Amino acid sequence: PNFSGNWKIIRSENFEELLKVLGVNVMLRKIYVAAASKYAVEIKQEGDTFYIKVSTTVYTTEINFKVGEEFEEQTVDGRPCKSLVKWESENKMVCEQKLLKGEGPKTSWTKELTNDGELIETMTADDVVCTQVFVRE
Template sequence: MLRKVAVAAASKPHVEIRQNGDQFYIKTSTTVRTTEIQFTVGEEFDEETVDGRKCKSFPIWEKENKIYCKQTLVDGTGPKTYWTRELVGDELILVFGADDVVCTRLYVRA
């Protein structure tokens, strides 16, 4: 599993984002896997954490161009996780958090 995560982290993923008001579709493709999520800001939805655990996610607008999403595990225990996505010019700043650990990834529009 760690090798797959390392390969994915080193790759240049392709991210497709479609927005219609508060409704979002986000598809992220890497050499390891492709993930797709659909959600409406302000409504809970089912999602998987980065490591594959099922969770309930609740996205809110943190500011005009930034979404904050809290994730709550469906079963078991684990770190408190969240993600944020913020558009700044031609850049997408994606932040994943798990308790006190934070990972930031920067995407640039092609």
């Protein structure tokens, strides 16, 4: 698979529930959900090396990793973490995260390329899974 693309979100489910697990207060959850329903993921994939640029209207962040090599990024609720990405299958990867400081719910994310041209992302905090779907623009 080639995950490279300028991905635009078309669906987002269970994001508020995810943020609730992470302890984000309700007022702040609603505006975070609002930012998510119009946010973008740009991916450049070169073999097992990935360059990810995630952005909203006012914020952008770059995440660069190689499958199987630990890197540093941040959790959904904005805390620094050490991350490790592995393939689960031909078209799906999974990232496990460990907080650099403190404790919290266990968090992870996945990316999957479907046969029909979609990118499915998930983000997990303990038992709650958020699922987001993107198409190329």
